[PDB]
């Protein structure tokens, strides 16, 4: 049984949501790795072919000594509220257009620079999700997740 996010569970009993979200990116590395990533928020669209990220509010962060990164992604949508739903990672925005505002993309601008004789070649990206400050949730006529208690063993 796939289990719900903290936000997924808390909004599980409602139907519509709104407000900004806060996506945090951790890079488990040293000061002796290096890399540029691009966090660009595409508010109404997908990231596909012909998608230039230069149209969009983006942040090009230089990860030499820096190690973490956290942005508040605003609520930009044609609807004052979007739909709470069953989450789907592998869907674009054009599907689930009713439940998401757009797509956010973390894109490499560069290979990871590292000398192999002292540090590794892999660095794990760790993504967290926080729910802003204006995050408002309405229409309590749904249930996506039923909770249950466990039995002592």
């Amino acid at each position: 049984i796939w289990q719900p996010s903290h936000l997924a569970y808390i909004t599980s009993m409602f139907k519509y949501w709104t407000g900004s979200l806060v996506y945090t990116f951790k890079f488990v590395k040293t000061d002796y790795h290096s890399g540029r990533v691009e966090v660009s928020f595409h508010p109404f669209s997908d990231y596909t072919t012909g998608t230039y990220s230069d149209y969009t509010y983006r942040i090009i962060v230089d990860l030499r000594e820096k190690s973490e990164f956290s942005v508040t992604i605003p609520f930009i949508s044609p609807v004052p509220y979007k739909r709470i739903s069953r989450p789907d990672w592998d869907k674009p925005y054009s599907k689930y257009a009713h439940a998401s505002t757009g797509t956010l993309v973390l894109k490499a601008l560069t290979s990871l620079k590292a000398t192999n004789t002292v540090v590794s070649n892999s660095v794990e990206i760790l993504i967290e999700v926080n729910a802003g400050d204006d995050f408002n949730v309405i229409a309590p006529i749904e249930n996506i997740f039923f909770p249950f208690s466990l039995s002592p063993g």
């Binding site: 609807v79 739909r83 739903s85 069953r86 439940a99 309405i138 309590p140 006529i141 749904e142 996506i144």
Partner: protein, 280 residues
């Protein structure tokens, strides 16, 4: 003056000012609606509060539930074409029909406008022996799932007890993502403008006949004038052509209202709802 070269009464001008009187004097008489009628009518926003009967659920079994869409009640029901066949001479006669439905005060106003905003009021009348009636709303679509649950654990519940209150009155709020929602059918599928909600009326013990009367909630508001709907003459209800097995009423209707006589018209053979493409 009354005539000239410029447009003497365009729309934008008619909304605000009237042309000169034929008398070239004051043409207006004072409002005395309160003095004869005893009441004043100025806005359809108040008139839609009047509750009239809208649909009826008969053709299911002895069930304990009846789920159906809410926005479909703001629409006026579909008008159907009824095929009648003479049991003797076998020639066809053709009339009109409301299949277990009828419009409301609300539906006369809602069909002039494009969008709505506010809550809908639903009142139920059941058959004898029913003890309770319960109402709950649910989203009709668990978005992203091919199926919707059959229960819910945080939805609204509202219980009315028939033998001590014979009409089960419920009020269904406005739950939709947008400012003002849409209530007519469309083929839009990318994301939605209607708040798609179900409404489940239960009866304990389970019963067959459910009579529904609908009306406007306090917060009811329509948005964009679009125009007068397609109508049918009310006098056409009593006009009939006689055939062997009975009467064929031009406007055939069912016992949608649990307090109206059953009209003595024979059942049809086929029903076809008038499509927008059928208009000539």
């Amino acid at each position: 003056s009354n005539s000239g070269t410029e447009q003497q009464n365009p729309r934008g001008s008619s909304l605000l000012t009237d042309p000169e009187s034929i008398t070239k004097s004051d043409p207006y008489n004072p409002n005395i609606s309160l003095l004869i009628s005893g009441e004043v009518f100025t806005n359809f926003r108040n008139l839609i509060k009047r509750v009239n009967f809208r649909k009826a659920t008969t053709l299911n079994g002895k069930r304990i539930s009846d789920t159906f869409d809410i926005n479909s009640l703001i629409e006026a029901p579909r008008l159907d074409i009824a095929q009648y066949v003479d049991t003797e001479t076998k020639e066809a006669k053709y009339g009109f029909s409301y299949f277990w439905s009828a419009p409301t005060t609300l539906n006369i106003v809602a069909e002039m406008y494009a969008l709505y905003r506010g809550g809908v009021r639903v009142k139920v009348v059941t058959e004898k022996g029913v003890d309770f009636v319960r109402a709950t709303v649910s989203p009709q679509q668990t978005y992203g799932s091919d199926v919707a649950p059959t229960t819910h654990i945080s939805t609204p519940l509202a219980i009315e007890q028939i033998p001590i209150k014979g009409v089960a009155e419920f009020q269904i709020p406005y739950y939709a993502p947008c400012l003002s929602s849409s209530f007519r059918a469309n083929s839009e599928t990318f994301y939605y403008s209607s708040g798609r909600n179900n409404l489940d009326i239960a009866t304990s013990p389970p019963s067959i006949n459910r009579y529904y009367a609908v009306g406007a909630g306090d917060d009811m508001d329509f948005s964009i004038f679009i125009g007068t709907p397609p109508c049918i003459h009310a006098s056409q209800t009593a006009q009939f052509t006689k055939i062997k097995q009975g009467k064929v009423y031009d406007l055939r209707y069912d016992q949608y209202d649990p307090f109206r006589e059953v009209q003595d018209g024979t059942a049809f053979l086929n029903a076809r709802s008038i499509e927008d493409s059928d208009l000539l």
